[PDB]
Write an enzyme that holds these catalytic residues in place. Sequence first.
Site, PDB file in Angstrom:
ATOM      1  N   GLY A 207      37.061  47.935  46.934  1.00  0.00           N
ATOM      2  CA  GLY A 207      36.348  49.072  46.334  1.00  0.00           C
ATOM      3  C   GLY A 207      34.865  48.889  46.524  1.00  0.00           C
ATOM      4  N   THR A 208      34.094  49.785  45.919  1.00  0.00           N
ATOM      5  CA  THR A 208      32.637  49.739  45.956  1.00  0.00           C
ATOM      6  C   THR A 208      32.050  49.576  44.545  1.00  0.00           C
ATOM      7  OG1 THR A 208      32.864  51.318  47.780  1.00  0.00           O
ATOM      8  CG2 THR A 208      30.602  50.914  46.914  1.00  0.00           C
ATOM      9  N   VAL A 209      31.107  48.649  44.405  1.00  0.00           N
ATOM     10  CA  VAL A 209      30.493  48.354  43.113  1.00  0.00           C
ATOM     11  C   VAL A 209      29.199  49.171  42.952  1.00  0.00           C
ATOM     12  CG1 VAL A 209      29.554  46.532  41.642  1.00  0.00           C
ATOM     13  CG2 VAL A 209      31.469  46.041  43.126  1.00  0.00           C
TER      14      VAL A 209
ATOM     15  N   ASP B  22      39.870  33.182  45.652  1.00  0.00           N
ATOM     16  CA  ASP B  22      38.620  33.363  46.419  1.00  0.00           C
ATOM     17  C   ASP B  22      37.409  32.830  45.634  1.00  0.00           C
ATOM     18  OD1 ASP B  22      37.096  34.104  48.661  1.00  0.00           O
ATOM     19  OD2 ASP B  22      37.101  36.271  48.136  1.00  0.00           O
TER      20      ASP B  22
ATOM     21  N   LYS C 193      33.386  49.347  39.646  1.00  0.00           N
ATOM     22  CA  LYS C 193      34.081  49.138  40.917  1.00  0.00           C
ATOM     23  C   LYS C 193      35.007  50.307  41.087  1.00  0.00           C
ATOM     24  CE  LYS C 193      36.406  45.294  43.258  1.00  0.00           C
ATOM     25  NZ  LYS C 193      37.633  45.608  42.509  1.00  0.00           N
TER      26      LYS C 193
ATOM     27  N   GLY D  70      27.184  47.588  46.474  1.00  0.00           N
ATOM     28  CA  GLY D  70      27.891  47.181  47.694  1.00  0.00           C
ATOM     29  C   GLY D  70      29.395  47.451  47.675  1.00  0.00           C
ATOM     30  N   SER D  71      29.964  47.707  48.848  1.00  0.00           N
ATOM     31  CA  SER D  71      31.386  47.900  48.990  1.00  0.00           C
ATOM     32  C   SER D  71      31.989  46.668  49.654  1.00  0.00           C
ATOM     33  CB  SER D  71      31.724  49.136  49.854  1.00  0.00           C
ATOM     34  OG  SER D  71      30.880  49.201  50.982  1.00  0.00           O
ATOM     35  N   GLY D  72      33.268  46.421  49.389  1.00  0.00           N
ATOM     36  CA  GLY D  72      34.109  45.577  50.224  1.00  0.00           C
ATOM     37  C   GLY D  72      35.552  46.122  50.263  1.00  0.00           C
ATOM     38  N   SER D  73      36.463  45.271  50.726  1.00  0.00           N
ATOM     39  CA  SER D  73      37.860  45.649  50.900  1.00  0.00           C
ATOM     40  C   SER D  73      38.534  46.161  49.667  1.00  0.00           C
ATOM     41  CB  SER D  73      38.691  44.525  51.528  1.00  0.00           C
ATOM     42  OG  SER D  73      38.503  43.334  50.791  1.00  0.00           O
TER      43      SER D  73
HETATM   44  C1  LIG Z   1      32.803  46.252  38.521  1.00  0.00           C
HETATM   45  C2  LIG Z   1      33.646  45.027  38.736  1.00  0.00           C
HETATM   46  C3  LIG Z   1      35.031  45.129  38.649  1.00  0.00           C
HETATM   47  C4  LIG Z   1      35.845  44.029  38.837  1.00  0.00           C
HETATM   48  C5  LIG Z   1      35.282  42.793  39.130  1.00  0.00           C
HETATM   49  C6  LIG Z   1      36.075  41.544  39.353  1.00  0.00           C
HETATM   50  O1  LIG Z   1      35.495  40.466  39.383  1.00  0.00           O
HETATM   51  N1  LIG Z   1      37.420  41.629  39.528  1.00  0.00           N
HETATM   52  C7  LIG Z   1      38.237  40.499  39.782  1.00  0.00           C
HETATM   53  C8  LIG Z   1      39.026  40.355  40.910  1.00  0.00           C
HETATM   54  C9  LIG Z   1      39.738  39.187  41.108  1.00  0.00           C
HETATM   55  C10 LIG Z   1      39.657  38.125  40.201  1.00  0.00           C
HETATM   56  C11 LIG Z   1      40.418  36.832  40.412  1.00  0.00           C
HETATM   57  N2  LIG Z   1      41.452  36.843  41.435  1.00  0.00           N
HETATM   58  C12 LIG Z   1      42.785  36.550  40.911  1.00  0.00           C
HETATM   59  C13 LIG Z   1      43.456  37.743  40.279  1.00  0.00           C
HETATM   60  N3  LIG Z   1      43.517  38.940  41.137  1.00  0.00           N
HETATM   61  C14 LIG Z   1      44.472  39.927  40.600  1.00  0.00           C
HETATM   62  C15 LIG Z   1      44.994  40.823  41.691  1.00  0.00           C
HETATM   63  O2  LIG Z   1      45.797  40.113  42.623  1.00  0.00           O
HETATM   64  C16 LIG Z   1      45.295  38.799  42.837  1.00  0.00           C
HETATM   65  C17 LIG Z   1      43.816  38.691  42.562  1.00  0.00           C
HETATM   66  C18 LIG Z   1      38.841  38.262  39.065  1.00  0.00           C
HETATM   67  C19 LIG Z   1      38.709  37.171  38.044  1.00  0.00           C
HETATM   68  F1  LIG Z   1      39.862  36.787  37.515  1.00  0.00           F
HETATM   69  F2  LIG Z   1      38.163  36.077  38.552  1.00  0.00           F
HETATM   70  F3  LIG Z   1      37.976  37.514  36.996  1.00  0.00           F
HETATM   71  C20 LIG Z   1      38.137  39.446  38.883  1.00  0.00           C
HETATM   72  C21 LIG Z   1      33.896  42.671  39.206  1.00  0.00           C
HETATM   73  C22 LIG Z   1      33.073  43.774  39.026  1.00  0.00           C
HETATM   74  C23 LIG Z   1      31.637  43.619  39.056  1.00  0.00           C
HETATM   75  C24 LIG Z   1      30.458  43.298  38.952  1.00  0.00           C
HETATM   76  C25 LIG Z   1      29.078  43.093  38.646  1.00  0.00           C
HETATM   77  C26 LIG Z   1      28.475  42.997  37.428  1.00  0.00           C
HETATM   78  N4  LIG Z   1      27.141  42.784  37.538  1.00  0.00           N
HETATM   79  C27 LIG Z   1      26.917  42.742  38.857  1.00  0.00           C
HETATM   80  C28 LIG Z   1      25.726  42.547  39.594  1.00  0.00           C
HETATM   81  C29 LIG Z   1      25.828  42.557  40.973  1.00  0.00           C
HETATM   82  C30 LIG Z   1      27.106  42.755  41.606  1.00  0.00           C
HETATM   83  N5  LIG Z   1      28.231  42.939  40.948  1.00  0.00           N
HETATM   84  N6  LIG Z   1      28.088  42.927  39.566  1.00  0.00           N
END
Ligand SMILES: Cc1ccc(C(=O)Nc2ccc(CNCCN3CCOCC3)c(C(F)(F)F)c2)cc1C#Cc1cnc2cccnn12
Lengths: 256, 273
Positions: free
Chosen positions: B21-23, B128, B35, B16-19
């Site tokens: 990138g796309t996973v 979020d 992503k 899936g994609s969102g704002s």
């Molecule tokens: C590929 C990937 C890449 C990145 C992220 C991800 O989770 N990235 C991410 C984004 C935001 C935040 C927390 N926000 C605060 C910090 N931010 C920094 C930038 O400016 C403010 C926001 C966090 C945190 F900290 F909570 F870890 C993490 C998730 C994925 C994924 C997958 C994944 C794994 N198996 C599955 C199964 C189904 C669906 N999917 N799937």
Amino acid sequence: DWEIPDGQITVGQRIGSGSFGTVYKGKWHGDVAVKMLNVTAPTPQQLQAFKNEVGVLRKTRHVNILLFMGYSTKPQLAIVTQWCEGSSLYHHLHASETKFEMKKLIDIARQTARGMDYLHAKSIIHRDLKSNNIFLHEDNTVKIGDFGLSGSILWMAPEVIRMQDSNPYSFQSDVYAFGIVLYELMTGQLPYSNINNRDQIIEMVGRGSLSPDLSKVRSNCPKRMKRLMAECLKKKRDERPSFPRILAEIEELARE
Amino acid sequence: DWEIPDGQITVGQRIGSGSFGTVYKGKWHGDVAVKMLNVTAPTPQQLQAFKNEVGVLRKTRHVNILLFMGYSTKPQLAIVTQWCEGSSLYHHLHASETKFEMKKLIDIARQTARGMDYLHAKSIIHRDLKSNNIFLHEDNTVKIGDFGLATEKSRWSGSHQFEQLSGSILWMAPEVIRMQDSNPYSFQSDVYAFGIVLYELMTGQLPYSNINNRDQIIEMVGRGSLSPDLSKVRSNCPKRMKRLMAECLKKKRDERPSFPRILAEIEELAREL
Ligand SMILES: Cc1ccc(C(=O)Nc2ccc(CNCCN3CCOCC3)c(C(F)(F)F)c2)cc1C#Cc1cnc2cccnn12
Ligand SMILES: Cc1ccc(C(=O)Nc2ccc(CNCCN3CCOCC3)c(C(F)(F)F)c2)cc1C#Cc1cnc2cccnn12
């Protein structure tokens, strides 16, 4: 940075001594394990060991490698990891009642192949791969580490036993050790269990007269796993395959 | 360093994609999630978001936070994480037949409190937090992230403000809904969001489900007239969890507790039984 300030970690029950230092269960934003040098005045050798260990753990982020979380220097030299619920593959196979289906034995081998393939890709040589160092977290995910808690000679490649060349450890010595793990999984037994003196195993494996008895693998061990196992146990170092090839062979064969 | 060379990662099924990138599911020394920014010409905002996301994921090593494994820059901007088997807490509660015993609902809340307590200790504000962003890996371990797939398409062609409307608004604290401050996100806005997750666990329902005008929820929560109906918690919801829930859902930002205090309360609550 992964340095943890003083006065954050709580140290609980002492689990055991291992490699360098003692392992404890602990509390730091949840359950953790804490390897701690229990020495008032550390030596330079001890300090360097600690830095080498942190040096390598720092480079790993993979689901099949024990999760490094940080380290601390005061009051003692300390490495912090995730806490693992369960017991080692060694415990399940050779100290317990537990039963694995062939599906799960292949999966354990595959998860172990992924983690080892990951380490070798980052130029890390384990040096002590064995079922006691493969943890079954929640009895479902392999976690490679060096948990400490003799022993290792069964997984030692001929070149390693012999010790001819300064530090004989190589990607291929790890490959041999993984071969012996495949023997454990596909036989349910430690190799050379028909031979009763530890001194003979050391001489004969290093001499090249003794290798594991591949007849003792199960009736439902797939034929490709048997061939692979034997490719890993090659007595000459350079005839052994590489982990990219090993991982691909175990993931192909597990699909079926 | 965590840069992954080109031509090592294999990209499989588009999840899936969102704002942001796309996973995809992918292959790199085992299963991974990828992503990938699926934009012909990235803006500076998008480039900076990518760097901020890598910047923070890099700082995390904890069993309750999604495991960052690396990133790639060519041919596209890409973040690589562990693949998670299972589905989100949102899926289990509101899109499924599954039944959790109170022991497990308390444990999910506790694992979530550990991960959030870890992030706030490293000065990371989620922004979020919601049940759709709490993953139940192997239906046993909480993994906090921002998975948030808004469409199933190759990219997200809506506004971020539409995206938030279809999802995020229920977990938004009053101050965040208003946007009266310049950047209204705080440790306490995360705490409010965790409060709403506790409501989901202890009720099995999304809050305000006896209302359908999404526009009214936005006005009334921000105005301070509407908060979750705490009567709809279960018969076997411990009284201390209920009291904690309401301390997290405080309309005034600074009356809310901190995660060290939240975690201490949930681990005492779980001690009993
Ligand atoms: C590929 C990937 C890449 C990145 C992220 C991800 O989770 N990235 C991410 C984004 C935001 C935040 C927390 N926000 C605060 C910090 N931010 C920094 C930038 O400016 C403010 C926001 C966090 C945190 F900290 F909570 F870890 C993490 C998730 C994925 C994924 C997958 C994944 C794994 N198996 C599955 C199964 C189904 C669906 N999917 N799937
Ligand atoms: C606290 C701790 C600290 C460290 C390690 C650990 O696994 N350390 C470690 C050491 C070496 C190597 C690979 N060889 C590199 C060799 N280099 C030259 C010699 O010096 C070291 C560097 C690797 C690797 F790479 F395999 F990951 C890992 C494990 C633990 C642990 C625990 C743990 C978690 N739940 C449990 C449950 C019961 C017992 N325990 N427990």
